[PDB]
Amino acid sequence: LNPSARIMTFYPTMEEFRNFSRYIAYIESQGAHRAGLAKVVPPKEWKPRASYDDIDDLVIPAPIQQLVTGQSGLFTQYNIQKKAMTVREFRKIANSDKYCTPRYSEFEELERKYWKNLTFNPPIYGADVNGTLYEKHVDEWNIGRLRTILDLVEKESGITIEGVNTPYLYFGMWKTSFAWHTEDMDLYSINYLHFGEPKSWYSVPPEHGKRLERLAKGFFPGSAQSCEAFLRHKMTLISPLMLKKYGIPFDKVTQEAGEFMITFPYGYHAGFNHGFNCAESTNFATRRWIEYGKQAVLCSCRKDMVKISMDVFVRKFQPERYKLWKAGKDNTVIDHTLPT
Amino acid sequence: LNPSARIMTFYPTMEEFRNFSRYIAYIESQGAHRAGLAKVVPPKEWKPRASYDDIDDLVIPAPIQQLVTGQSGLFTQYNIQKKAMTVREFRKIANSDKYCTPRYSEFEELERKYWKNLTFNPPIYGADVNGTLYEKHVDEWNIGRLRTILDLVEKESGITIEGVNTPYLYFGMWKTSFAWHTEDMDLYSINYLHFGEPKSWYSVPPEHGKRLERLAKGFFPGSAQSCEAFLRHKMTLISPLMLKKYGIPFDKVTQEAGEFMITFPYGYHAGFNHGFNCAESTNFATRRWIEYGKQAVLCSCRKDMVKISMDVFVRKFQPERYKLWKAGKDNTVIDHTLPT
Ligand SMILES: [Cl-]
Ligand SMILES: [Cl-]
Ligand code: NI
Ligand code: NI
Ligand SMILES: [Zn+2]
Ligand SMILES: [Zn+2]
């Protein structure tokens, strides 16, 4: 099931959509997770918010400017912090003549332009904004309260991790980028594009993640020297042309307003925004993730970084192996194809 | 005198060198200041310091990484702050295989390389380090105590301005850059290259500064919109090929270890380091500067920036015009050619 590991798109009915957990399992039962990434277009009956008319006053505390250096499809992205601005201010710049989306025909033409011009004209990205655009009445696919077993991190340790077990908003503009990475603790993510122009994504099947890690280490050995998980710094950009060249399998998908994307444990993704827009994301967990989390290779090289204790998930959901794992003796092998 | 406004080099004897003020006047009497920049190679009898063997332990608190974006000779340079390192650490990186000076023949070949590669491989620059490498016994050309009338800023207002009336050290490496600018308040500067590889400079005659300002505003109108003195942000790099093209006259000069450079009021300069090195600089003033300082166009757009009060210099050195200037009625025109 999903032999080719292509990115699947799903159209749940309202009835299916009302159960989050079951639907994630369903799409895994269809092999969605093999591609690393899937699209879910929600039922038309559903709406996260009445309208987006009342948010120009919303404050993006820490926009960042994306400076990118490199050539022939390899690049590194440095984030310069800029001062507080409002969505109103952000929108004016995004729509301004210097920063706005070029004219184009097919997405293939806009994609060529992103890669020929990513080093020029650094854009602002209103990233990592704490908050949510969902009205409180909304019970389905509400990113602020999915009620997955990730909630055990908070319930048992009083711990908050911004953007991991709380929601983040991302205001974008043409050519703002997200670099190749997997999620914190190789968790799942969910991303909803509330409005505006598209966000294109690239994904590599989890069963080929190690081959992308290997290639990255080749091209950036110094970065590989000082961190094992350097891709987790989210600074590394690699062209699809580079990926074909070193035979890394990958797929591409464009997300439009009103659509969800789900990323799956150890699914490497990257991409960029087409123009002004607003996405909302968080991380979540399932019982299948637990193994991935026990085995996730973390960033050593910074003290900021996200470490979740696996003790509570193994204690409850893998009792048969708890003592074994506790003693360094749990040698489970992950099969990335299983829908477990 | 100096019709062509070329960068002059001077070889003072020890006897001439012992009087700083007089020697600056002498070189101005030869028209050195018309080029904006002059070299002074000091008498061999003189040495700022016995040796530079005891400074690996010296701490550079705020190295910065120089990210540069642009193309066909126009660029903007953003400074990412990195963590504390020692000269020892700095030296290892500077000398490392990824960061070190390419092999080359003539400087013309190394200059081509700086401009073809300035956007790649961002280097660290151990800039703006408070301190001095001069032994205390040294009375000539001692950057920490030139005793110019700039000392009135401190004596009358208790004011310290790091790198302006105190010394700064600059540890460099291949391809670290200083962008087109004039000094704070269009003051004079002095730069001494204590050791290591060269530092190349570009200069534009003060009598053609407005033409470079004009060209800059053309190429960066947005930056020109929000600041009048945007070049003062020290972010703007412009190729010599661009300067020929728009007919801005300029000259180039390479400074080697043990040599001083002097910049003159309203002399636009820029350049770069050839490899690992260490320069020391500060600003100074003469009576000729006072007019330039009364008329200097400042950065509006940041509250950090350097504003020196001219009151005390006009009061003492232009008493005939004090009341007039006080009342908005002093309409002196600067002649950049005069040695005044
Ligand atoms: Cl590297
Ligand atoms: Cl501009
Ligand atoms: Ni992510
Ligand atoms: Ni300067
Ligand atoms: Zn790391
Ligand atoms: Zn300014």
Numbering used by the authors:
A (entry chain A), B (entry chain A): 8 to 347
Please share text taken word for word from the publication where this structure appeared.
Members of the KDM4/JMJD2 family (KDM4A–KDM4E) catalyze the removal of an Nε-methyl group from Nε-methyl-lysine residues and belong to dioxygenases with α-ketoglutarate (α-KG) and Fe(II) as cofactors.
We next performed molecular docking to build a KDM4B⋅myricetin complex model using BIOVIA, Discovery Studio (CDOCKER) since we were not able to obtain well diffracting myricetin-liganded KDM4 crystals. We further evaluated the inhibitory effects of analogues based on three separate parts of myricetin: (4-phenylpiperazine-1-yl) (phenyl) methanone, (E)-N'-(benzylidene) isonicotinohydrazide, and pyrocatechol. Additionally, we have determined the KDM4A⋅63S0 complex structure in which 63S0 is a pyrocatechol analogue. The inhibitor 63S0 coordinates the metal ion with two hydroxyl groups and makes two H bonds with Tyr132, Lys206. Of note, 63S0 coordinates the metal ion and makes H bonds with Tyr132, Lys206 in the α-KG-binding region of the catalytic pocket.
